[PDB]
Design a protein around this ligand. Sequence first.
Ligand code: NA
Ligand code: NA
Ligand code: NA
Length: 125
Amino acid sequence: SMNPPPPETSNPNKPKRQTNQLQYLLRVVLKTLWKHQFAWPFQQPVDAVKLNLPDYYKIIKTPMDMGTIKKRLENNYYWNAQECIQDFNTMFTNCYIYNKPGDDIVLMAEALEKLFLQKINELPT
Ligand code: NA
Ligand code: NA
Ligand code: NA
């Protein structure tokens, strides 16, 4: 019923680098979604306490959010684009698992995911 600690956004042992693809993921993908009108619920870890959702972290064991993603990218936490794309996918999957089809938050996620897939289509090959 507490929130869990947030996902780590830096690790002193994990190697860093910034690929052209990782730059694109921060400067195009993350930024386009971050600025979207529906972005706020996804801009930080789900606060199950403030939202009064005591079963959220009983159901969702791999939480992820764009604030974590953004910090990870800003910190060169990822080694490759696939790691970061996986975190976006996890973020969307979590929302669909926990919520019902037709919920406002699911419609918001579906909107962001459509934009995400469109921008990943232009990831530098
Ligand atoms: Na570039
Ligand atoms: Na996805
Ligand atoms: Na569900």
